[model samples]
Target: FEPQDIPLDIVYEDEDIIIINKPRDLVVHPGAGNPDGTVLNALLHYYPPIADVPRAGIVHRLDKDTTGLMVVAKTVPAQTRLVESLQRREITREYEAVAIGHMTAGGTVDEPISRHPTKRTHMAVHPMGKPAVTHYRIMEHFRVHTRLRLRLETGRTHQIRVHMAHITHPLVGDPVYGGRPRPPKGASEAFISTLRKFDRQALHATMLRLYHPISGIEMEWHAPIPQDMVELIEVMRADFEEHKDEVDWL
Candidate 1:
């Protein structure tokens, strides 16, 4: 792939790794339909040495519209060790998301997930799928949505989205999994419009903890939620403040 000068939100960088605060709509790597203008292409331009590393030293990935922090290895050995850490469950990743229902409480979902049989590109909770686990706690609750703090034990493709959908609480703005927008009973037109315009899943990788592959020291990184999600949550908070007295939970 040809190197391109794409700007990266570099959070931290060392000899072994580069921690990036990835924004929404930026693909992590080259794939079908996304031929170039990806994180990998930017990495190649930022550090030519990474071009020699396998897969541009990408240890893990976030979806095209999922904003979050991601680590890129600078060497082959670092990549191997980081991948090993991920498989061993030593790496901890926490996400913040807005789900489409007022989840009564927090819980864990220990289900298996695989590609949907009929909708080839979609993921679903299936009997023959690989094991996936997600633990979630309530961060805040709105009339028609709930903010969640989620930790992953096994990072299967679309684990959080599929698991949430299985529990009937798919993430807000999840185009594939979320059925439709359900505004608050007394929601204002502006609030409804904001909900309608949210085009991507309301998910962000807010925290990541892992041991440095070469140094063997534990490290953690946190990325602030992007502007759009911030504005969306702010709107929810405002609506909640105005109509909280009408909520059943109260």
Candidate 2:
């Protein structure tokens, strides 16, 4: 109930809007079973006026375990404009992630997704589902892991997760879509051990761009990757730099 006092990483704020760097494992809105200690609750505690807006003026959302930049409206007028802009596809959100397998090139996934046929809590690619598009480019590569930058054209439940998994490059450490980590042949014991110990999905909503709801000014925000991910990436960097040239020599 004292979410205002609970430490939150606020990135930017104004009379019309507030931006935040949402940490991993933090829920955005409260659920029926979880009616406390969410981002909305924190916003409400800090900016009481936002409670009047729908879902504390959260125009969009990231999954519970996804970390990144998010925006909230502070007033009814801002909420209306934000909602309108979102519906019109005026908001641009980008994510950076480390996939479990090697990805040689960038590509796009223009597939449709829906709830799994039997697993009610999971998502799957289906013909009858809503259309989802994701554009992705390789940012970096390790022997067994590839870092990617992704952009979504349509936001749906688990769009990025499902799409990436569908292509057999599930995000590293994704508990839902991927299994235990696997290091390549000749991978260092240190790399293998560090990867196996990483527990959360290796995905981050890194950047967000949108037009100011109240001012029509364009705005963009970037959130630094969390410490856990940074550490994991560093491990990959070291492994790759050490092994990259030896492959050709062999």
Candidate 3:
């Protein structure tokens, strides 16, 4: 797919690095079915010098539908250093999501995750899998759902999704891990319609903190939650406000 000549959101830029707030639904890199019109393609076009750097100096990634902050390097040395920092757990990433159940309290999910034995594209909790840690706190609770804030200690693919589902609380609107939609007992038709219409996962990489690869200076960036999620959360709150005593979403 050819990406439109759309402008990118460059949040910060210096001699050695570039930071971006990636939009939802944009692929970070090119692969089999996607060859062009990705963030990489945009980076190459907008900043020709990035072409010489590996993966255009992208040290980390967010999923196709997971919107959030990302850093790109302008030089090979910067890219290498940033990657080393990530390996040392120096880069911190935090996310906000809407999960499917009402969580009573905040906690951590420590488990091992690996590629599914049969489903080549999916991940599962397995004994032989790599260690993955996710710490989460409940922001708000509706009868049928909970808004959660999550912090990642390890960057394992599908870590949050797999762990949440393993605990029987997959993210809302996550097509792969989340099962069928379960509207609240006394949900309004309009509220139910909104929930049903949400097609992508309600997950966003909201915050990123790290040290500059070259400058060795601390830096941080926060990407505000997209409109869809903000509106969705409001709907959930309104629903909860109106029917607290009638239907316990938990």
Candidate 4:
């Protein structure tokens, strides 16, 4: 693949690794329908030496629409060790998302997930699938939605999305897993429009913590919620304020 000059949101950089605060719509790697203009392509352009590293040194992946922190190794040994650490579940991957329901409490989802049997593009919780665990706690409550803080114990494809949907609370704006928008009763036009305009999954990888692959030192990085989610939160807050007396519906 040819390198393209895509701007990278470099959170931190050193000889061993590069921490990136990825944005929405940026594919982590090239694939069908996404031939280029990926984080991998950009990394190749930014540091041609990354080409020698496998998958441009991507340690893990975030879906094209899920924005957040990702770490890339700069060398083969770093990549290998990082992969090992990830497999051992020593890496901390924290996320925040807006779910489609008003949750009353926090809990964990210990379910196996695999690709859907019929739906080619979707993942589902399946009895025969690989083990996936997600821990989630309520961060805040909207009139009809819940803000949640999540930590991943295993990084299966679409693990969080599938687990959330399995519990009947998929992330808001999640195109596949999200059942439907659950706007509160008597919602204002502004709120409804904001809800409609949220075009991607309302999830963000908020924080990442891992020991340096090469240095063996601990490190952490965080990315503030994007503008779209911030706006959505504000709109939800306003709607809640206006309807303070109404009982939260589902």
Candidate 5:
């Protein structure tokens, strides 16, 4: 991978707390197949002091392809406090996504999500998995797609993606669980034609809220949907308009 000077979008900052608008397609931490150019590396370059803190000051993380608001702690005390708040569900995390098919206008997905038994890298809703709760409301609808606002009540690995897939509303462009088996004859020519133009999953970390780790003040952060997702929505909308009469809205 080519290492370039990536700009950090600092949403909120202070001596103790720092919130960033993390971009999509970047890994949050170091892991196999991703050794450098992660958010942690950028943070170290931006705030060298953070290197002294564990996990490079990250309180939580988003997937490599998931973009949104994220908080980073600058001190040990701040990290501890932030983790505690998250454990108590005191912090609010909301995301905007485009799922592959029509779904209920609003609903809650309460399921247990766990690592797949055979596929080590992916997660699934298993009988013995940890409980995860995701509440979603439909923000817009196309002939075969749904735009959603999702709120997390409990955070588990791949909770939103796993739960949404369980409900048959997998995120569009999600290569793992989101891309389900095609219909017997394959996707419609129009759907296939539209999909060829897009790449990554349609998930955006749009809003986050929490109390200041040190100051006892409330804070909220927001990130606009990225350009690619915005463009995809427009394309889907145009397609739906042309097929509205013959299509069924969920």
Candidate 6:
């Protein structure tokens, strides 16, 4: 991919700490398929001094299709301390997402996830997999969908996605999972007709809380719901309200 001028939403910045509102559909780092235009690239441009820092000062990452708040270290000491904190699970990260169906009001998915046996690109809940935990609470109920606030106790690749799907409420617009079957038969045409209207998945890193590496203070930051998610919520709510009599699930 070609490098481009991508703007980053820096939520918090200091000599030792930096927090960013990572947008959806943007790669986080350089990899086989994505050679440029990553969050790391953008950070290097914005904080040129941190270029020498490993991984462009990134302590953790969200998938390219995932949108959320990410913390970066600007100093070596900060990087070391923050990474240690993350490994200890001292940092608290929360996300908001819209799933395909109404899930339990609140619950935990403690399944172990591993690479799919047949699908090379997918992960599954397998007996030999590593431990993964995801907790969720229902936020809003729609006729055919539900909004949820989720917390990750153990961060794994596609943890939320896999857990939600395991519970039968895959995130909306997540084509890799079961979301594709939830829409109408001609959903692709319908979705395309509404292009620029909606295309990305309905998940957002709403809040991130962590202890400052150097200040020894607890800091929390939140990002407003992105426009795409907000629009989808509105659409679902309207549909639910209009068909209230026919909608019995909650």
Tens digits of per-residue lDDT, candidate 2, 1-250, equal: 4355446788999889888898877888777666777887788778777778877888888888888888888889999998888778889889999998888999999999999989877899998999999999999988888999999888888889889999999988888888355567777788888788877778899998998998889989999998888988999998888886767675
| Residue clash pairs of candidate 3 | 3-37, 143-249
Q: Rank the candidates by lDDT, best first.
A: 4, 1, 2, 3, 5, 6
- Pairs of colliding residues, candidate 2: none
Off by over 4 Å in 2: 1-5
lDDT of each: 0.89, 0.85, 0.85, 0.90, 0.82, 0.80
lDDT of 5 by residue, 109-144 (tens): 888988998998899998788988999999988767
TM-score (C-alpha) between model 6 and the true structure: 0.87
lDDT (Cα) of model 3: 0.85
Residue range with the least summed lDDT across 10 consecutive positions in model 2:
1-10
Tens-digit lDDT string for candidate 1 (9-67): 99999999999999888998898788999999999999999988999999888878889
State how far residue 17 of model 3 sits from its true place (Å). 1.9
Superposition-based RMSD of candidate 5 using all C-alpha atoms, in angstroms = 3.6
TM-score of each candidate structure, all chains considered together: 0.93, 0.93, 0.90, 0.93, 0.87, 0.87
Candidate 4 lDDT (Cα, whole model)? 0.90
Which candidate do you rate higher for lDDT, 1 or 3? 1
lDDT of 3 by residue, 1-250 (tens): 2324757898888999888888877888887677777888888778877778888877777777887788888999999999999889898888999999878999999999999989877899987899999999998888789999998888788788888899989988888997447788878887888898877888888988898898899989898998888877989999988876556565
Rate residue 73 of model 5 by lDDT.
95
Q: lDDT tens string, model 6, 1-250?
A: 2335789989989889889999888888888777888988888778787876777788877767778799999988898998899888889889999888755588898999999999988889887899998889899887667899998778787888888999888888776777654353323343434323555567788998988999989989999998878777776776667577556567
Query: Which candidate has the top score in lDDT?
Result: 4
**Candidate 5 lDDT for residue 67:** 86
* Deviation from native of the Cα of residue 209 in model 3, angstroms: 1.1
Q: Give the CA lDDT, 0 to 100, for residue 214 in model 2.
A: 80
Q: How many residue pairs clash in each candidate?
A: 0, 0, 2, 0, 0, 0
